[model samples]
Target: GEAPNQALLRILKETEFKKIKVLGSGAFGTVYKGLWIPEGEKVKIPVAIKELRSPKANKEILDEAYVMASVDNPHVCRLLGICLTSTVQLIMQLMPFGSLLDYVREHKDNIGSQYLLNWCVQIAKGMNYLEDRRLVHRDLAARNVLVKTPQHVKITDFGLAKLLGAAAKVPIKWMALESILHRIYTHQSDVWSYGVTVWELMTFGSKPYDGIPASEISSILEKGERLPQPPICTIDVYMIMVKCWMIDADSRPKFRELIIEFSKMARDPQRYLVIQGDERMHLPSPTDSNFYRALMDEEDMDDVVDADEYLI
Candidate 1:
């Protein structure tokens, strides 16, 4: 029998998930922080419930489900269950620390360089797993990466993910320069997004276009300008990001190499601990708020562009 929308709501309300709280809302759905009580279990575990709006249901949601069903990586959020009916809901392991975006917003002032390096490493691990399966996380941003604890980070929100050879079109902005302009996206493009994601984690969740207007930023990226140098990112990390953004997508490093690079930094605390003077510099106050507003606006986006379409 197809799960009824009301039954899904009732199940959530009756279980320990009753305490479910809204963690964040996005263009497609609202994410809830809930407790998952396994069948016949006495204890409850935290979980994240992604509730999709009825009108937003499409191939993307189904594709994400298919990808999640096939992936079994610890760094990636584990899909516990799903509700398929008039609306859709995906229940997965929840990270209590919330999103990297929220965490950075709250503690940007006190975070050290070493902490940033640690986060970059974890993100790399998750991306590596995705690449191994030839999966591309098109919308790789801070909000989608959840921190389980200060020490661990997991990648979530596969609604915008694309599987190689899946015979479907993915959005262009999420693709690399070659893909966005030439209409080709490969695992290498995923690396480019991963680099951006690393920048987000290091900057305490700052968006890619922090001070620049969306149009201006898009223009810059379209012409091959990578994200402006991050204030706090280590030299090696920043260099790796540059590599990810190379105009020639073929020149980019693979996830396997990315994992090793991140691991090397993780083991050498001193390499990343020495914060450059620029890391302590702060962007003007109003900039972050404006960025936040733009991020909020993206939540309501309903139109899905075919992979071949240039979003420019």
Candidate 2:
């Protein structure tokens, strides 16, 4: 081995790693589950190796390696290194429990309510660290969140995170409308998705917008439509989600505010204030099918129509 080059240029010795299987795939690349056998441990270390689909993606892959190297937090995934060849690849630690969505779907039936609440708190704190460094995680979603231990729900999948859609699945329902319209992404926009993620946790991995199609979400959002509180969700948590869906991006709360509010609500939810039994604050989830059907039958049934219906 050539003693490994620079970080991006590091040479992966052919015998050092073996491709065990594919871990996950995306619009751009696939992450392989690899086993790295060091010089003399006689043990295998599981790692994630991402291979890009195109040569043009190398620069993005390179830049992503740098971003990953710089960021370090308990709630965020750790990037070990990358293989910088014609088809660049990234190496990362493997989370045994899979993504947050996966965990919720499989285990929500027996978990305590505070379990999901705690996950939300973990996500907020993770984003708080990113915001502190001025990084905007545009693809904030339950799928992007990974779990290892009960208290460690780490924010990963940075392979899809960047300014605007930079090759990530754009979740229309989870995104701020202004972001969809103008491609403006900020910490506040991240707050918007963070709120939707809460909806995901509360409903035990239920789809954020229920049965609504991606193509129709923007118009619905433009009309002030938000994901209604799931039946089991309480008043305190529901109010926070509604505010995060505010049409104007500037109107949304910061990650800092959300972290504190979510933290407080989790501790003593018995007393979190509600604005006067606030009937108007609630949303309409599990919506009437006819409403969307009517929108489809209308003459003005389109947007600024996008191509792949980018909602994740």
Candidate 3:
């Protein structure tokens, strides 16, 4: 597939890019804070550089070009280009606020229902655009979402993206019961992850299914159990969140409908939520230990013992 906008794609030289800082490094590769100085331009522009940690053993199953070139929307990240430089890498817009997961950590308190609803609307709008193009964001989470400004955000990281729906290993906690039972991926599966992300916004980064072991997540949901509502979330807001987590894919709201639902709610969110005290009941306390969380925090695998360990 051709790029959504070929004008956005760029090819840069290795000598032109100077790594300034390391933003993130992981199994996929290392992301660097870098500067791009176009020829004859004295002013340097800040950019993000993604370099693979390991060389390509084979071709990528879902080429980045196919997804990035196909999407055109304000709510999704715009792929700047690829580096035909020595090792080959991806160059794209640098979202300074980092991931939604990071922004939630920084601004957990003092957040009202209006702002939360606004963020949800943006995500839904972005996903709606993808849905229009027959794309499925198999991995939708606070961590995968990116923030451009305080009130502006866009969906990013199509590493787990798909078209017309396909199956693959997915995060257990964010998955719908039907998706887990049968390894199927669909827009509705993405809706399930959307529900967990709304929980992230409501809880200000509360780990989904806290204290529930990964081994038990399947059996627990098997017994009709689900994530508890975050305390700060009002009844109306949590109801929408629950609707996204419905066991059946047909029960989930499409991104288009969700956009309409959240857009109206944001217009008059006061009645939907009443601020209570700042005590977040769902997050693990400082004293709380030996509990299971749905998200990973470690940058590197310093300790591999807990990688596969699941509590009873």
Return the TM-score for each candidate structure.
0.74, 0.77, 0.81
Query: Sort by TM-score, best first: what order?
Result: 3, 2, 1
Would you list the C-alpha lDDT of every candidate in the order shown? 0.64, 0.69, 0.71
lDDT string, candidate 3, 1-312, tens digits:
634545344466767756767899977778886655556644344467777752351134127755775677888976656676445677666666689888878776656677778899999999989888778887889998887666778899887777773454467888777777887888888888888888888788888888877767889887877788776667888889889888878898888888998899888877665555333323212211221111122232232122012111
Residue-wise lDDT of candidate 1 within 1-312, one digit each (tens)? 323323122223333443346877777678786555544544444556776664547466666667676676767877766666556667677665678788878877766665677677777788888877777777776777876666667888777677676222443333467655555557777788777777776666666766565435446886667776765556767888889888777798878888788777877755664554524544233323343224233332233121112111
User: What's the residue-level lDDT of 148 in candidate 1?
Assistant: 65
1 versus 3: better lDDT goes to: 3
| Candidate 2 lDDT, 1-312, residue by residue in tens | 223324333445546766767777778788876655555645444566788776568877877777787677878877766765677777776665678898878865555555666787889989989877667788889999987555568898665565333222566877877788887788888888998888887777898767888898999887877888776667877888998888777788878788787777768543542222323332222223343224223233223111112111
In terms of lDDT, the poorest run of 10 residues in model 2 is 303-312
Candidate 3 clashing pairs, residues 3+ apart or interchain: 3-69, 4-69
Model 1 spans > 4 angstroms off: 1-19, 54-60, 84-86, 166-175, 222-224, 276-312
Segments in model 3 whose C-alpha atoms lie over 4 Å from true places: 1-9, 41-44, 54-58, 165-169, 276-312
Model 1 steric clash total: 2
